[PDB]
Structure formats: C-alpha cells, structure tokens
Amino acid sequence: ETTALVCDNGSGLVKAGFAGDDAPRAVFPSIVGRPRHQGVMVGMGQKDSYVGDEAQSKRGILTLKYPIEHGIITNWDDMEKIWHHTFYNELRVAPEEHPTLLTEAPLNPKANREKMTQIMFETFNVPAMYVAIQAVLSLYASGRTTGIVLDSGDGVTHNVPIYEGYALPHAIMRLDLAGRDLTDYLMKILTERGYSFVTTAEREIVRDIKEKLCYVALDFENEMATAASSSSLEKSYELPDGQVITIGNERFRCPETLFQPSFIGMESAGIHETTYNSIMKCDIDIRKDLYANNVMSGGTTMYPGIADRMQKEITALAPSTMKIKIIAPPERKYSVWIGGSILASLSTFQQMWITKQEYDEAGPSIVHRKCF
Amino acid sequence: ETTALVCDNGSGLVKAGFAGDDAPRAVFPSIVGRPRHQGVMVGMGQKDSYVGDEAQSKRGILTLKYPIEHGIITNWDDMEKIWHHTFYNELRVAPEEHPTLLTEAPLNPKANREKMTQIMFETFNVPAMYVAIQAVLSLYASGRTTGIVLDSGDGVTHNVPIYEGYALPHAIMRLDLAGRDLTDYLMKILTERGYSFVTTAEREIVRDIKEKLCYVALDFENEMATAASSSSLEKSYELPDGQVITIGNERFRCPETLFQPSFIGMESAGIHETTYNSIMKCDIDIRKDLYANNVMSGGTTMYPGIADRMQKEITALAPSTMKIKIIAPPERKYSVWIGGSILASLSTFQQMWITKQEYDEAGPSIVHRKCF
Amino acid sequence: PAYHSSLMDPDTKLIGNMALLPIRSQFKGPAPRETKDTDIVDEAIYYFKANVFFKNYEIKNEADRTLIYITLYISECLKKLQKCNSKSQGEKEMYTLGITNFPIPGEPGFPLNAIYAKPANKQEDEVMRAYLQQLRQETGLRLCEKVFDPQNDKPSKWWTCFVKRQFMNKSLS
Amino acid sequence: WXAXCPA
Amino acid sequence: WXAXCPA
Amino acid sequence: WXAXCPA
Ligand SMILES: Nc1ncnc2c1ncn2[C@@H]1O[C@H](COP(=O)(O)OP(=O)(O)O)[C@@H](O)[C@H]1O
Ligand SMILES: Nc1ncnc2c1ncn2[C@@H]1O[C@H](COP(=O)(O)OP(=O)(O)O)[C@@H](O)[C@H]1O
Ligand SMILES: [Mg+2]
Ligand SMILES: [Mg+2]
Numbered sequence: 027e028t029t030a031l032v033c034d035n036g037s038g039l040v041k042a043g044f045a046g047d048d049a050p051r052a053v054f055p056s057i058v059g060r061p062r063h064q065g066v067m068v069g070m071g072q073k074d075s076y077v078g079d080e081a082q083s084k085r086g087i088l089t090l091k092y093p094i095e096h097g098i099i100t101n102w103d104d105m106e107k108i109w110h111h112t113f114y115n116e117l118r119v120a121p122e123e124h125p126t127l128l129t130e131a132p133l134n135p136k137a138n139r140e141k142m143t144q145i146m147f148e149t150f151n152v153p154a155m156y157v158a159i160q161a162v163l164s165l166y167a168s169g170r171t172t173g174i175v176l177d178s179g180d181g182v183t184h185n186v187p188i189y190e191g192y193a194l195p196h197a198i199m200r201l202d203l204a205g206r207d208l209t210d211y212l213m214k215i216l217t218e219r220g221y222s223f224v225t226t227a228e229r230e231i232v233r234d235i236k237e238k239l240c241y242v243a244l245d246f247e248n249e250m251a252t253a254a255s256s257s258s259l260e261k262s263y264e265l266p267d268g269q270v271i272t273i274g275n276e277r278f279r280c281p282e283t284l285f286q287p288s289f290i291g292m293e294s295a296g297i298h299e300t301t302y303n304s305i306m307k308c309d310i311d312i313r314k315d316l317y318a319n320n321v322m323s324g325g326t327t328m329y330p331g332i333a334d335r336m337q338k339e340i341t342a343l344a345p346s347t348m349k350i351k352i353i354a355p356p357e358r359k360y361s362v363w364i365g366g367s368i369l370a371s372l373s374t375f376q377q378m379w380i381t382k383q384e385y386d387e388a389g390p391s392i393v394h395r396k397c398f
Numbered sequence: 399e400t401t402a403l404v405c406d407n408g409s410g411l412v413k414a415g416f417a418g419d420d421a422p423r424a425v426f427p428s429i430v431g432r433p434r435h436q437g438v439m440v441g442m443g444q445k446d447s448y449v450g451d452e453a454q455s456k457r458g459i460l461t462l463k464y465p466i467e468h469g470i471i472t473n474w475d476d477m478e479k480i481w482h483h484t485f486y487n488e489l490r491v492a493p494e495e496h497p498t499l500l501t502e503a504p505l506n507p508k509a510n511r512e513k514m515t516q517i518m519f520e521t522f523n524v525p526a527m528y529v530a531i532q533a534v535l536s537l538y539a540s541g542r543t544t545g546i547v548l549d550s551g552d553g554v555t556h557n558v559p560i561y562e563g564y565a566l567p568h569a570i571m572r573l574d575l576a577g578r579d580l581t582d583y584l585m586k587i588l589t590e591r592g593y594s595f596v597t598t599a600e601r602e603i604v605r606d607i608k609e610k611l612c613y614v615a616l617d618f619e620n621e622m623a624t625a626a627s628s629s630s631l632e633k634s635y636e637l638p639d640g641q642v643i644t645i646g647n648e649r650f651r652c653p654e655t656l657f658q659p660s661f662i663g664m665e666s667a668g669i670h671e672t673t674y675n676s677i678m679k680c681d682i683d684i685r686k687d688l689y690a691n692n693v694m695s696g697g698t699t700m701y702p703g704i705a706d707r708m709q710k711e712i713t714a715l716a717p718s719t720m721k722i723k724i725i726a727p728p729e730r731k732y733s734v735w736i737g738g739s740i741l742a743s744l745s746t747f748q749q750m751w752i753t754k755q756e757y758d759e760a761g762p763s764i765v766h767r768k769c770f
Numbered sequence: 771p772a773y774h775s776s777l778m779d780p781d782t783k784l785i786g787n788m789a790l791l792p793i794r795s796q797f798k799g800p801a802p803r804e805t806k807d808t809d810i811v812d813e814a815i816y817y818f819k820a821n822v823f824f825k826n827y828e829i830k831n832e833a834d835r836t837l838i839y840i841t842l843y844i845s846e847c848l849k850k851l852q853k854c855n856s857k858s859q860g861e862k863e864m865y866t867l868g869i870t871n872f873p874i875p876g877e878p879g880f881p882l883n884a885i886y887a888k889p890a891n892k893q894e895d896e897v898m899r900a901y902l903q904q905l906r907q908e909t910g911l912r913l914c915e916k917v918f919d920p921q922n923d924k925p926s927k928w929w930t931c932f933v934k935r936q937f938m939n940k941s942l943s
Numbered sequence: 944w945x946a947x948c949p950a
Numbered sequence: 951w952x953a954x955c956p957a
Numbered sequence: 958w959x960a961x962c963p964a
Contacts (some may be wrong), residue, residue, distance in 0.1 A: 202962060
C-alpha cells in the first residue's frame with residue numbers, strides 16, 4: 027500500500043498507470059474481438075477471445091466490437107475481460123496490493139455506477155476505490171480552479187462550468203456527438219468520393235486516416251471555393267495494400283459536423299452554441315471569469331485550428347467589449363489521467379476513499395452520495 | 399488604554415476606526431454570505447461562512463443576507479460574526495485593550511440594546527463601552543448645538559429636534575423608508591423598462607447603479623415632459639458581463655419616492671412633511687432657530703439637488719417672511735463616526751462610560767438607566 | 771509554571787531545539803514505539819485541565835517546549851471540535867486538521883517563535899515536519915476517545931468550556 | 944418587528 | 951429578457 | 958440507453 031492505480035475507461039481508448047508518474051504505462055484501445063471464421067489447423071487452440079493491441083494487429087479475421095458506446099457500457103463481459111487483461115497482462119499488479127480510481131462522464135445512469143462498484147468490490151476485492159469526473163481531473167491537471175471544460179471524448183462531449191471552490195451542477199450539458207459519429211460521416215462521404223469502407227477493419231483504417239489527415243476550416247464557404255480550385259489542397263494516403271487514396275474537401279468537411287450537427291440530422295446545436303448557453307445560464311459575475319478561462323480536453327479536439335475557430339465564434343456571439351482567451355495545452359490527450367494521478371497523490375484524499383467494510387455494511391447506494 | 403474604538407452598525411454598511419483619526423480605518427458592507435451550491439473539488443475546505451469585501455467579490459455563488467433590517471437586528475449570529483471579523487481580521491486589536499463605542503437609531507426596542515450590551519460585556523469582555531445616537535454625533539461633527547437632523551440612513555430615516563444644551567424627546571419621528579425600499583422600487587421599475595433583476599447579486603448591481611446614476615428633480619412634471627422629449631437625458635451603464643443598459647426617467651423617479659411615499663403604497667408623508675410636523679410640534683421661539691439650522695446626514699441624502707428641493711419645499715410650506723438655509727457638508731457619509739470620535743476624545747466623557755464592575759452586578763438593564 | 775514537564779531522561783535526543791520524545795502511535799513517523807501507555811501526549815492531556823489557568827511557564831527542560839506546543843494545538847482542536855455531531859465526524863475533522871500546513875517553529879505565523887530555534891539544514895526541516903504531523907495525529911486520536919461520551923454523542927461542555935481560555939492569551943490562529 | 948413591518 | 955434570464 | 962439512443 028504505497029501508491030494507487032488510475033484507470034480511465036475512455037469510450038474508445040483505455041489509459042492506466044501508477045499514481046505519481048507523469049505518463050501512462052498502458053495505452054491500448056478498447057477492443058474485444060472474437061474469431062469470425064471456422065478454423066481448420068490443429069496446432070493451435072488459441073484464445074477464443076482477443077483483446078488489446080493483439081486485436082488491432084489481427085483485426086482482419088475478427089468482428090471487433092466496442093464494449094462502451096457513447097459513454098454507457100453495453101456488454102459487461104467485455105468490460106470485465108478488458109479490466110482483467112489490463113490488471114494482469116499489462117500492469118501485472120494484483121488488485122489487492124493497491125486501490126483503483128475510476129472516472130466516468132457526467133449525467134450517466136446510476137445503474138452503471140452501481141454495477142461497476144459491485145463488480146470491482148466483489149470480483150477483484152480491491153481494498154478501496156473512488157469514482158470521479160473527467161472534467162474536474164482536467165482542471166486539476168491544468169492547475170486552475172476556475173474555467174469551463176470542453177471534454178470532447180471519443181464517445182461523449184460535455185461541459186461543466188466551475189468557480190473557485192465550487193461547481194454548478196445545474197449548468198451541465200452533455201452531447202452524444204463524438205468521434206464515432208465523425209468517423210461514420212467520414213465513411214459516408216468517402217463513399218461519395220468513390221472509396222467504400224464497411225467492416226470494422228476499414229473503420230479502424232478510416233479512424234487512422236482522420237487522425238492523420240484532418241483539420242478544421244476557419245471559413246467553410248471560402249474553403250469550399252478554394253476546393254473548387256482543387257490544385258493545392260488534395261493529399262494522398264497509402265493504404266496497407268498499397269492503394270493510394272486522394273482526399274480533398276473531406277479533410278475539412280467532417281470536423282465541421284461538430285459546429286453543424288444538422289449534417290448528420292441531429293436537431294441540436296454546435297459546441298460553441300452549447301458552451302455559450304451553459305455560460306449564459308450561470309450567474310452574471312462569474313461569466314467574466316468563465317470567459318477568461320476556457321479549458322478543453324479530449325482526443326477529438328486535437329484538430330489544428332480548432333482553438334482559433336472556437337475563439338472567433340465565441341467572440342462573434344459574445345459582446346465585443348471584453349477579451350476571450352482559449353488555452354490549448356499540447357498534452358490534452360492524457361489530461362484526465364494526470365489529474366487523477368495528482369488527485370490521488372493529494373494527502374487530504376487518502377481518507378475520501380470507499381473501503382470494503384463501509385460498502386458492505388451500507389450497500390452500493392453509498393457511491394451515489396459520494397460527491398454526487 | 400490610550401484610545402477607544404467607535405463602531406457604527408449602519409443598516410447597510412459598517413464604519414470603524416480609532417478615536418482621534420479624521421477618517422475611518424475600515425469601511426465594508428454588512429454582508430454574511432454562505433455557499434448555495436454543493437461543492438466538488440477536494441483541495442478546499444474553505445470558510446463555510448463569508449463576510450465583508452470577500453462576500454462582495456464572490457457574491458455570485460452565495461446567498462447574501464443583511465443581518466440588520468431597517469435598524470433592528472434579526473440574526474444575532476451574523477452580527478457577532480461581523481463584530482469578530484471587524485475586531486480581529488481588520489482592526490487586529492483585542493477588545494480588552496481599548497473600549498468600544500456603539501450607536502443605534504432612536505425609538506429602537508430595549509431588547510436589542512440589552513442583548514447587545516450583554517453580548518459585548520460577556521463574549522469580548524470589553525473593559526467599558528457606551529451607547530449613543532447617530533444624530534447627536536452628527537451635531538458634534540458639525541460643530542453646532544442647535545438644529546434639526548435628517549439622518550436618512552440605508553435602513554431608517556429619523557429626525558430629532560435639538561436646542562442649546564437640551565433635546566426634545568417628544569418631537570422625534572422615525573420613518574422606515576430608506577435606501578433598501580428605494581432599491582426595491584428601482585428594481586421594479588427596471589423591470590417595467592425591460593431589464594430583470596431578482597437575486598442579491600443583481601441587488602448589489604442595482605445599488606451601485608443607483609449610487610452612480612441617480613439624482614433628484616426640482617419639478618416632477620417638467621422632468622416628465624422633458625423625458626417625453628427623450629434625446630438628452632438617457633444615460634448608459636456598463637454591466638460586468640458587458641451588456642449596456644439605458645436608463646431614462648428612472649434616474650429621477652426612484653428618489654421622488656422619498657417625497658411621495660404613496661408610490662410604494664405606504665400611508666405616510668414625505669421627509670419635508672415629517673420635518674415640518676416635527677418643527678411645528680416644538681415651541682414657537684425655537685422654531686426660528688430650527689429653521690435657521692438644518693443639518694442632514696446619511697448615505698441616502700447625497701443625491702445632487704436634494705438640498706435645493708428640500709429648501710424649496712420647506713419655504714413653500716413655511717411662511718414666506720423669514721429665511722430658510724440648508725447646510726449640506728460634503729462629508730456627511732462619515733459624520734456619525736467623526737462625531738463619535740470627537741465625543742470619545744472629550745475629557746468629560748472619560749467617566750460616563752459603563753464598566754464591568756457594573757455588569758458584574760445585574761442583567762444589562764443598566765444600559766438604559768444611564769448610558770443613553 | 772508550577773506544573774511543568776516531566777519524564778525526560780538525558781538520553782533523549784533532539785531536533786534543533788525540541789526533544790524527540792517517543793510517542794506510541796499506530797501511525798507512521800520518525801518516532802519509535804514505547805510499550806508503556808505513558809508518553810508526552812498522555813501527560814499533556816492530563817495537565818491541560820490546569821495549565822491553562824496559570825499565566826506563566828518556565829521552560830525548565832526542553833520537553834517544556836513540546837508540552838507548550840501540544841497544549842497550544844489542543845486548544846485549536848477543542849475550538850474546532852466544539853461543533854461536532856458524530857464521533858465519526860469528530861475523527862474526520864481531527865484527521866483533516868492533522869494533515870495540514872501550520873506555522874512550523876522558526877518561521878512566521880508561530881507564537882513565541884523567539885524561544886524556539888530556527889532550523890538551518892534541509893533534512894531537519896522535513897524531520898520536524900513529520901514529527902509534528904505525527905504529534906498532531908496522535909493528539910487528535912487521543913482527544914476523540916475522551917471528549918465524546920457514550921451518551922448524547924456530543925462534545926461535553928466540561929471539555930469545550932476552555933475554548934475561550936487561549937493558552938498564553940493567544941493561539942496559533 | 945413583531946407586529947407591523949418584518950424585523 | 952434582455953438582462954437576466956433569456957426572454 | 959433503453960429508451961432514446963441505443964446504449
Ligand atoms: N491524433 C488524433 N487526431 C485526431 N483525433 C484523434 C487523434 N487521437 C485520437 N483521436 C481521437 O480522440 C479519440 C480518443 O481520445 P480519448 O480522449 O482517449 O477518448 P476518451 O475520452 O473516451 O478516453 C479517438 O476516438 C480519436 O477519434
Ligand atoms: N455614493 C452614493 N450615492 C448615493 N447613495 C449612496 C452612495 N453611497 C451609499 N449610498 C447609499 O447610502 C447607503 C449607505 O449609507 P450609510 O449611511 O453608511 O447607511 P447607514 O446609515 O446604515 O450607515 C447605501 O445603502 C446607499 O444606498
Ligand atoms: Mg476518455
Ligand atoms: Mg446606519
């Protein structure tokens with residue numbers, strides 16, 4: 027009992043490591059694949075189930091399925107399998123030796139929290155654990171006490187206004203739009219270009235393509251016009267088979283779905299509009315502080331130029347009499363994990379944990395009252 | 399034991415300082431705020447209760463409540479907290495080292511005086527103290543012995559006719575109308591314009607707006623007619639969020655409530671009528687002296703043109719055969735504190751104090767008998 | 771003054787000025803374990819009911835400084851614990867009070883700082899930090915077991931009446 | 944107050 | 951509304 | 958989810 031482990035069950039990726047380290051010791055995607063063919067050879071009876079980078083490597087003969095969908099778990103067996111894999115094969119640390127820290131998106135059903143706590147306390151018999159929010163850990167990592175969080179993850183995008191020493195639970199907005207919808211739209215448009223991708227392996231391929239050759243556009247109409255003069259924007263990507271795909275307007279089209287949800291058909295508003303509404307719902311005095319500090323985190327906000335576009339949109343919407351600043355740290359991908367590690371390292375938090383004795387005597391409902 | 403401290407528990411503000419100084423050393427509003435939200439962050443266990451300029455700064459997440467209402471204390475815990483704060487954090491002077499001077503409005507319940515004396519003698523064990531009236535201290539500050547006081551404070555407005563070496567306790571009139579009612583009426587009218595303000599933070603905002611952009615009108619009907627030609631009277635104010643509010647007739651409407659209490663629905667008379675009645679109830683000979691000297695004090699009488707309007711109204715009501723003069727010192731805000739300091743500095747007053755031997759002997763029924 | 775310290779053999783070590791007298795505690799720190807229940811904290815609690823009344827204290831031995839510091843911290847502990855509701859709540863408050871950052875001797879914010887010494891080297895700084903943290907935690911654990919009673923589950927008036935009787939007229943705050 | 948006005 | 955609340 | 962959205 028010297029340190030604790032912080033695990034972030036990201037909608038598309040899993041981050042884990044020791045409390046104190048500045049970088050995670052295990053970064054693998056949440057994939058639980060199973061064989062799709064029959065199998066003929068006799069000299070292998072291997073691993074009916076597959077998880078982790080192994081699944082990514084041999085994805086061509088497997089039906090990859092994401093255990094977590096838009097922040098809510100759908101298959102508990104897959105999640106338990108991934109937990110076991112991360113704890114034993116990668117970390118090689120017994121659950122009893124150290125406690126575990128878990129994080130989840132806001133406005134999630136209580137059933138998920140109760141089931142997760144029960145499974146953690148019963149199966150792995152962890153000495154203690156806790157449940158927190160990714161945005162607050164982002165604040166802790168950023169070393170700030172006031173601001174607004176843009177936690178645009180792979181499965182969920184949400185904001186949580188905060189003030190010195192307190193939060194505003196009544197001004198929390200959660201948007202289902204996230205990286206998965208962007209990937210689906212990218213596949214749909216790549217179909218309109220002439221390239222077809224359906225199965226999950228090509229889903230991973232398109233995910234990589236978006237990760238490597240996508241960016242946001244300051245002006246949509248101007249970019250479209252310059253695309254009409256398509257002689258300096260098209261770029262080529264090399265597929266595993268060697269085929270070359272040329273991508274033009276699709277580079278700056280899919281990211282615009284974040285600011286224009288109507289493309290997918292969702293009757294909602296963009297991230298800028300939702301943040302403006304959330305800040306407006308707050309008290310007048312704290313609006314200045316919230317404007318002066320705007321923290322963003324998540325893997326969906328690494329597109330170059332996103333910060334500039336958000337700043338321009340907010341300044342256009344907000345009155346043109348003050349200053350709006352956007353802070354874009356270059357390590358926002360692991361901000362949640364860093365915040366969790368720092369929070370665990372805090373001396374005052376050594377007593378806020380939830381132990382087996384109190385959990386057993388009280389019941390699963392205790393976590394509900396533990397910091398909401 | 400070299401000096402004494404004078405504290406004025408104003409209905410909306412607190413003034414304190416050493417006996418001898420010409421300016422107060424501590425000027426903060428009477429606010430005792432408590433958090434209204436839940437609180438999530440762990441690196442803060444801070445100050446469940448808030449008081450003073452701190453409360454003003456972070457008023458956006460607190461339920462501000464004024465401990466004193468219309469001159470009478472409603473919550474004793476808040477008053478004791480503010481007393482402790484002023485004595486320790488700001489003044490940094492122990493109660494035992496020096497005595498304390500307290501002031502209160504006239505015609506106040508004896509229960510408040512007895513409770514205040516008991517708390518002061520028991521909790522802080524002050525060596526000695528005294529209770530006085532703000533109007534008499536105003537006379538002392540003005541360096542005059544005859545006149546009529548218009549002590550229109552934030553919570554109470556009252557008058558006390560005086561003559562050379564004696565007072566007239568039977569001609570004292572106290573009016574509940576004060577700055578708070580004016581602020582409420584200002585909020586109500588600002589609603590009729592199109593701007594809404596409900597919570598206490600916007601109450602402070604409207605208080606500042608009135609403090610900065612309000613004035614009295616010599617003629618109500620003429621000002622209304624000129625407002626009909628609204629091209630030179632409207633003024634703009636900048637809110638913290640940057641929004642701009644245009645104020646027209648409201649600038650000279652709310653102050654008129656003092657001369658026309660019927661606006662709020664109170665079946666009473668204006669300050670001019672009450673002063674005329676008070677002076678008439680006095681003896682005939684002293685009426686000339688009272689007319690020749692009219693001292694006014696308090697934070698509600700700083701509106702430009704108030705003195706001229708009062709002079710015009712009194713001359714119209716009074717016979718047009720003598721001269722009526724209005725004296726409006728430019729430092730009437732702290733006149734009470736200056737008078738208290740001067741009274742404490744008086745050599746003859748060094749024996750009028752009330753000591754602890756006194757209280758060691760009987761419930762503070764002694765405040766009244768003496769010390770009045 | 772008259773009721774000064776006791777139980778200080780010459781073999782006892784020191785940290786700059788203070789006496790690193792062992793304290794028995796289930797917690798961890800740079801201190802050893804003494805089988806006998808007697809220790810600095812027990813004597814401090816035993817004599818606190820009378821040390822407050824007196825208005826002087828001659829530091830006959832170095833343990834007098836430890837007694838002064840422990841009583842001074844106990845004053846704040848009692849002040850903060852007067853508003854307690856449950857034994858668990860009182861223990862929580864005492865624990866969060868122990869894990870804090872109070873004025874270390876030799877630095878500003880510390881009363882009677884003249885009597886105490888000013889550490890110079892780096893290691894002694896954290897040695898004193900850990901020693902004082904252990905003392906605070908032990909004091910908190912010791913108060914919670916007698917301040918409360920089996921009945922009424924509230925701080926006894928007898929033990930919180932001394933809240934206003936600040937030692938040497940002043941406290942850490 | 945107790946009767947008349949609030950305080 | 952214009953200030954305070956939306957409407 | 959059970960109602961609204963899939964999860
Ligand atoms: N280099 C990248 N460029 C663009 N998007 C990326 C990049 N890396 C990850 N992403 C996107 O961010 C998502 C993962 O970020 P992450 O924060 O780990 O999601 P989560 O919050 O559930 O942990 C992926 O779905 C991916 O679409
Ligand atoms: N600069 C100002 N202009 C107009 N009114 C003011 C100004 N400053 C304060 N006031 C008003 O006077 C009140 C405070 O004056 P004050 O005399 O300290 O009240 P009190 O008599 O209880 O001490 C405030 O409530 C405010 O409405
Ligand atoms: Mg995540
Ligand atoms: Mg006053």
